Design a protein around this nucleic acid. Structure first.
Lengths: 107, 214, 70, 60, 148, 197, 35, 443
RNA sequence: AGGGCAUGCAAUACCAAUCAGAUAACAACUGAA
RNA sequence: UCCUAUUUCCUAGUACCAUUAGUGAACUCAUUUGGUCUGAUCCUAAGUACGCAGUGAGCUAAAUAGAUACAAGGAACUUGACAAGCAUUAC
RNA sequence: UUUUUUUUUUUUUUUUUUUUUUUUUUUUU
RNA sequence: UUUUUUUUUUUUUUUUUUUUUUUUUUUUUUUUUUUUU
RNA sequence: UUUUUUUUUUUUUU
């Protein structure tokens, strides 16, 4: 629900500093390599997951901005942006295939 | 920004919580949204993605003020702004929300405590506050002044609540009952706009515009 | 003006003896804030007056220490 | 000398200036001048795949 | 100025408020007020109270207070208080006047078909100046220097 | 207390205009003056003077008293010490709770108090005092009536009247309005004009 | 410009006058791209 | 230019008056709004002609026509009866979609014609498997409005709804439930299953807007179990803001009935919840304008002639009373009618029985007067007075209301027809007495 | 140039008497560019 | 059965934009304490059953700008009656 | 409570703005 | 007399205009064609 | 200076 907006983030008042630091950790962005092997449904779900993570991150970003301080672990945003771009790249190529085919038949 | 199409499969809208320095109600949350979204669209976003219960959505336009580069050893005298134009959204959720998320806190400035001060302050240059009539105050769907003594409510209110208004009168801010015969104010105890029958007859005085005619 | 664009710097050039003090209004405003915190039950004046490293629980001060010889 | 934003905008605005028999060759901060400004420079040692140059002639 | 272009009377006006000449009878008229059969339609009192104040004559015993719903005026209401019915700056003697800017009393009287006005400074005292002006007018009338 | 600690709603439940404005400011200072366990105040008509019966805290015996200290000497109360830090650390209560610990007083001294319009203490009376005062009421009314006869009028009025009767009283001018080009003559005359048919 | 005066004037972009000069930041001799 | 002083004054005063007048108009206008909403996701694309030849019409055509007529409020007997006649002929070639439309139209129009309902029911019963949410909802909704109970078919409808729960709409599901509860055709097992599905539906696919529609006093106390009762009651409190007087009334009624009938469940509620309802009663709830019926007036005249004081119309907390005695307030009368009973029968409705029992519990000496019994008396006043007097000396009705004897369409028709002329002759006689007719002109 | 590339600069002129505007039924109705 | 006819009608959650609700010329201008004072209205007021507002220190020089009180004479002053004065005094 | 929209009344266009994106086979559920 | 307002829209009257049209929201009530008054 | 279901259209008027 609404709680998701701040749950597990630094903004969460029901957890300690160690839990927030443990939660803060993240991995690598999804590459085109992996993103190419997935189907339409998996990419569609991953898009919404990345959007939720971006929405959570933005809050912290703004919070930090308020106090004139740098956000902890700023690379997350970058990671999410790269994954979001790669998904659409994949899809667009998939489409271009068909477009080409069509063109060919008309000619 | 780009217009939203009919069928949205890969939405780009980014939703976030905004920490406001003013006081907010229990069932009210402040969000930061683009300047190109509607009430309905906002409602649906939260209803479908988050699946949160929503009642009302209010929108406001936020524009940063102008600033000038005057300070420093080498000022430029150039104009600028801080932040960006956005839509301040206010969502009236069904459930309650903690204040520690929506409202700011600071110990250095003890005066900055919107959560503690509640609506007692204006947080702006408002010398006089404004408060329209309440639902309960209004005629339609309003609390009755004589319904307390009814038989039906008492049935419900069985050893659970006292409907008698005489048991909830502040003693530190109330005066003793005066005598009708004797002069007295109307506002002392008469919480209405009609003269009680108990009050004796009152005389009327008409101003004399041309007393010299006498 | 906050932007500092009007001709409001002209008068300031000349010397002056004194200026008004809106004590009456300021007092009222302060009182209202004090009241708004008092209804909740927190002392603002006390905290705005206590010595840096001073601890005073409740309504206490110098006077408290008088009778509290032991 | 009164202040009238309506008058100002109805007589001295972007759409009102174009109707003026003036020397438009002069540069204007808050106007639509007709002076050419030479665009983006030549290319050094960057990636050749990411050098932008045209848009209205290429839109598809 | 007392120019022709003014009402002849100085009484409060209560003009008739006629209803539109195409509406049907009100809803409150359908009420059976008989002791045996009783029928109180919806908003009967609401409609009738308003309707009663149409004629303009039947303003009721308490007219100034039967329509002022605002608490602003009610807050100031008092009972069993004696009040005067004459402005302090209004002498009963004809020809006396007071000026706000000049802050002084004046006496108007006609002599030999010519208008003449005298000054009376009220700085020393309002009552003293008022009585002096009244005495001057009375002396004029007694000595017989006012046309008639 | 004259105020409800942590009251409901988002706004004050009492008037904040007129005299009430002053009264709120006056009462906010002292949030604990009126004992929680106190009888309702009873003001008198002529002069604002209220009466109320309450229970006061005990005190240490004078025997065990050190002595007067400061410009306002006062006897110490009778109270027990608060839990120590070692026990509070093991106590399951929170830091907030632990820090907020206070002593414990004994309220077993019933007394009657008289205050002003402002609820300012003035005097304290006990049961024995109150009972004793009742037996001398008839003896005081006669003394008050007898003493009422010794008062005499103020000779100020008579002295002022005699002064003004047998002394000079100069009076100065007022409102000396000037004039422009044309001067005044005590009275003015209007103009006469004819109609245009 | 007043309403009466403005109601009897055309736009500058309605004419060829805008393609009869070479004024630019470089100078007075402008050469169009791809010329 | 310039104006005359005389005219100037008048024009300025007139102008001022205008301002005053305008200020004086928007007083009561509180609930208005410049913005409004119109439903448009139901009209058909194809064009039809209501005034066309019914013979050339088909199922599709007729279906469209029926709904368009209803929407345009073109109430024409001559027009509607032709539709019914053609529908009867084309009954064997109607799609589930078309049938639903037909039903909706009829219901919206309130076209009281049992002959068509009775003929179209059996075909619906056979096509139930191919039915959809919309059709299923419209059938019941129409039926309810027209007050034609069918426990044989209504039950089947419900069962098909339960079978297609995974495909149904929350709104339609809710309305089905409501309809079922009002008609009184759900055995315990069906009721239980309905309740169980309803709770999940409400808690999974319902919002503030959609939840309000689930509130029904008749349904709550006769269909809904305790677990759903408690959840409903608790969620109402939270969802109260986004409500209307129509839902408020229902809520209050629900509360009252629950308190009166089910003390246990009432006590099971929380303090906070209880407080809500407690405070609710104290508020003034708007109500629609009401007036006595012709039957009511006739009964009142007979009663008054008998020599008993009473009232016409008045509210008592949450329930309306037809007649209330002044000498003994405890006493009360109720004037029934054709609508009070199901079509072609004399069986009381669930709402009438619930309101009767609630007042009987609360101690109200309740009496009932039927219309079919009354009509028989004709235009005689002594017979009515004696009729009333014989009733008065008798004890009141029991707590539990019972149904009347059997009836038929034929009888119903006959009665109606008979009454038609009585209501006109009495009006004529009443109206004639008011005319003095004294003045005589010479001419 | 693999992919993407909101909005504004008033645009039927890759054509066609002139005269306002999304470029005007005849006539009234006029002209140094 | 003596009503002018005994003709059902609370209120559909609601697009986009404006707003600091009180005193105060808050507008051009500028030697700009925004808010007190300087003028008519808005409150049946013993000035509204405590409202708004109020800025270093010291000191008998003379001159100048003003206020109050001047013996007798009362235009002898001045180009000119400019200016000043009268219009309050037993209560 | 205003603004928006009809009339007064005007492409007497208030650049980056609108009930204004190609103008109804809309899959009525 | 120095000789003064009316169109959008509302009400009334007169009618063969039209889903470019009022919830598939809700209440009340004796009730309506042709072969039941 | 148009007030609550949207358009077209005719006469009078407080």
């Amino acid at each position: 629900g609404i709680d998701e907006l701040w749950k597990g983030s630094y903004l969460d008042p029901t957890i300690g500093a160690k839990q927030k630091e443990a939660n803060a950790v993240a991995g690598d962005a999804w590459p085109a390599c992996l993103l190419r092997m997935k189907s339409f449904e998996d990419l569609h779900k991953l898009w919404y997951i990345c959007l939720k993570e971006k929405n959570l991150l933005m809050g912290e970003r703004w919070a930090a901005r308020q106090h004139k301080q740098e956000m902890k672990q700023p690379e997350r945003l970058q990671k999410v942006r790269r994954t979001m771009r790669r998904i659409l790249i994949v899809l667009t190529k998939r489409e271009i295939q068909q477009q080409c085919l069509r063109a060919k038949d008309i000619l | 920004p780009p217009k939203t199409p009919r069928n949205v499969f890969f939405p780009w809208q980014v939703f976030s919580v905004h920490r406001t320095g003013a006081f907010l109600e229990r069932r009210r949350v402040a969000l930061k949204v683009p300047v190109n979204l509607t009430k309905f669209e906002i409602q649906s976003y939260l209803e479908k993605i988050y699946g949160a219960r929503v009642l009302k959505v209010s929108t406001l336009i936020v524009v940063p003020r102008r600033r000038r580069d005057i300070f420093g050893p080498r000022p430029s005298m150039r104009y600028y702004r801080v932040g960006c134009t956005f839509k301040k959204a206010i969502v009236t959720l069904e459930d309650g929300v903690p204040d520690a998320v929506k409202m700011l806190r600071s110990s250095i400035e003890l005066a900055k405590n919107p959560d503690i001060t509640k609506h007692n302050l204006t947080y702006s240059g408002r010398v006089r506050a404004f408060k329209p009539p309440s639902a309960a105050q209004r005629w339609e769907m309003g609390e009755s002044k004589y319904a307390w003594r009814l038989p039906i409510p008492n049935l419900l209110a069985g050893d659970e609540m006292q409907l008698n208004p005489a048991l909830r009168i502040d003693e530190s801010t109330t005066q003793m009952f005066p005598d009708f015969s004797k002069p007295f104010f109307h506002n002392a105890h008469f919480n209405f706009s009609w003269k009680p029958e108990e009050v004796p007859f009152q005389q009327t005085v008409k101003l004399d515009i041309t007393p010299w005619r006498r | 003006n906050k932007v500092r664009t009007d001709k409001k710097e002209r008068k300031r050039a000349f010397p002056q003896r004194g200026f008004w003090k809106k004590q009456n209004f300021l007092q009222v405003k302060n009182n209202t804030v004090r009241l708004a915190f008092a209804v909740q039950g927190v002392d603002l004046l006390k905290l705005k007056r206590l010595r840096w490293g001073e601890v005073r629980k409740g309504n206490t001060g110098w006077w408290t220490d008088d009778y509290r010889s032991p | 000398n009164e202040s009238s934003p309506l008058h100002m905008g109805a007589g001295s605005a972007n759409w009102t200036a174009v109707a003026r028999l003036e020397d438009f060759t002069l540069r204007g901060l808050s106007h639509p001048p007709w002076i050419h400004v030479s665009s983006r420079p030549f290319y050094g040692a960057g990636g050749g795949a990411v050098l932008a140059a045209c848009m209205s002639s290429a839109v598809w | 100025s007392a120019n022709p272009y003014k009402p002849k009377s100085r009484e409060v006006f209560h003009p008739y408020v006629p209803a539109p000449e195409h509406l049907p009878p009100p809803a409150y008229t359908t009420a059976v007020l008989k002791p045996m059969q009783q029928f109180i339609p919806k908003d009967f009192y609401r409609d009738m109270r308003v309707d009663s104040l149409r004629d303009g004559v039947s303003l009721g015993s308490d007219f100034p207070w039967n329509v002022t719903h605002k608490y602003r005026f009610w807050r100031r209401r008092k009972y069993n208080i004696q009040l005067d019915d004459r402005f302090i700056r209004l002498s009963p003697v004809t020809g006396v006047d007071y000026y706000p800017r000049l802050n002084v009393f004046a006496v108007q009287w006609r002599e030999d078909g010519q208008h003449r006005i005298r000054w009376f400074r009220a700085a020393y005292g309002l009552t003293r100046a008022m009585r002096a002006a009244e005495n001057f007018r009375k002396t004029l009338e007694a000595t017989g220097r006012v046309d008639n | 207390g004259n105020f409800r600690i942590k009251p409901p709603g988002a706004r004050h439940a009492f008037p904040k205009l007129g005299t009430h404005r002053m009264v709120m400011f006056r009462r906010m200072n002292l949030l604990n003056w009126p004992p929680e366990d106190a009888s309702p105040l009873h003001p008198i008509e002529p002069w604002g003077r209220q009466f109320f019966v309450f229970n006061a805290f005990a005190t240490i015996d004078p025997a065990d008293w050190c002595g007067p200290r400061g410009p306002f000497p006062r006897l110490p109360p009778l109270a027990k010490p608060a839990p120590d830090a070692a026990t509070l650390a093991a106590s399951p209560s929170s830091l907030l709770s632990a820090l907020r610990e206070t002593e414990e007083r004994s309220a077993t001294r019933t007394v009657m108090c008289v205050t002003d319009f402002a609820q300012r203490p003035l005097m304290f009376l006990g049961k024995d005092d109150f009972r004793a005062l009742r037996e001398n009421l008839p003896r005081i009314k006669e003394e008050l009536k007898a003493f009422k006869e010794r008062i005499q009028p103020n000779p100020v009025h008579a002295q002022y009247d005699l002064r003004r009767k047998l002394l000079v009283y100069p009076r100065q001018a007022m409102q000396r309005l000037k004039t422009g080009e044309h001067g005044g003559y005590g009275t003015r005359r209007g103009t006469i004009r004819e109609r245009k048919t | 410009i007043r309403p009466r005066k403005k109601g009897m004037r055309l736009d500058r972009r309605r004419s060829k006058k805008q393609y009869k000069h070479g004024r630019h930041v470089g100078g007075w001799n402008y050469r169009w791209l791809g010329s | 230019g310039i104006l005359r002083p005389r005219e100037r004054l008048l024009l300025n005063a007139l102008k001022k008056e205008a301002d005053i007048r305008y200020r004086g108009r928007r007083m009561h206008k509180r609930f208005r709004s410049w913005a409004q909403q119109r439903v448009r996701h139901y009209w058909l694309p194809q064009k039809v002609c209501v005034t066309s030849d019914p013979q050339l019409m088909d199922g599709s055509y007729i279906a469209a026509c029926v709904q368009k007529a209803a929407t345009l409020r073109k109430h024409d007997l001559q027009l509607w009866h032709g539709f019914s006649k053609r529908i009867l002929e084309l009954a064997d070639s109607l799609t589930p979609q078309q049938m639903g439309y037909i039903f909706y139209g009829y219901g919206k129009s309130l076209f009281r014609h049992e002959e068509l309902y009775r003929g179209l029911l059996p075909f619906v019963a056979e096509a139930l498997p191919e039915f959809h949410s919309h059709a299923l909802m419209t059938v019941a909704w129409a039926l309810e409005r027209v007050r034609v109970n069918d426990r044989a078919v209504v039950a089947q409808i419900a069962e098909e709804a339960l079978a297609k729960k995974d495909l149904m709409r929350p709104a339609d599901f809710i309305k089905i439930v409501n309809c079922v509860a009002r008609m009184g055709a759900a055995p315990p097992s069906l009721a239980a299953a309905l309740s169980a599905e309803l709770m999940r539906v409400l808690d999974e696919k319902c919002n503030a807007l959609l939840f309000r529609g689930a509130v029904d006093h008749v349904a709550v106390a006769t269909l809904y179990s305790d677990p759903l009762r408690l959840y409903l009651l608790e969620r109402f409190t939270k969802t109260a803001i986004c409500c209307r007087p129509m839902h408020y009334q229902k809520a209050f009624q629900s509360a009252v009935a629950i308190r009166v009938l089910h003390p246990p469940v009432w006590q099971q509620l929380s303090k906070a919840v209880r407080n809500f309802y407690i405070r609710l009663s104290l508020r003034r709830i708007p109500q629609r304008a009401r007036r006595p019926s012709p039957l009511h007036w006739d009964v009142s005249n007979a009663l008054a002639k008998l020599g008993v004081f009473h009232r016409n119309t008045f509210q008592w907390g949450c329930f309306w009373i037809d007649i209330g005695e002044i000498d003994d307030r405890r006493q009360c009368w109720f004037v029934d009618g054709p609508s009070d009973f199901y079509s072609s029968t004399n069986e009381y409705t669930e709402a009438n029985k619930l309101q009767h029992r609630i007042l009987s519990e609360l101690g109200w000496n309740i009496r009932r007067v039927r219309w079919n019994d009354w009509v028989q008396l004709g235009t005689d006043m002594d017979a009515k007075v004696e009729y009333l007097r014989k009733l008065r000396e008798r004890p009141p009705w029991p707590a539990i209301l019972t149904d009347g004897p059997s009836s038929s369409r034929q009888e119903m028709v006959a009665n109606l027809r008979s009454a038609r002329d009585v209501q006109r002759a009495l009006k004529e006689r009443r109206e004639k007495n008011r005319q003095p007719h004294s003045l005589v002109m010479n001419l």
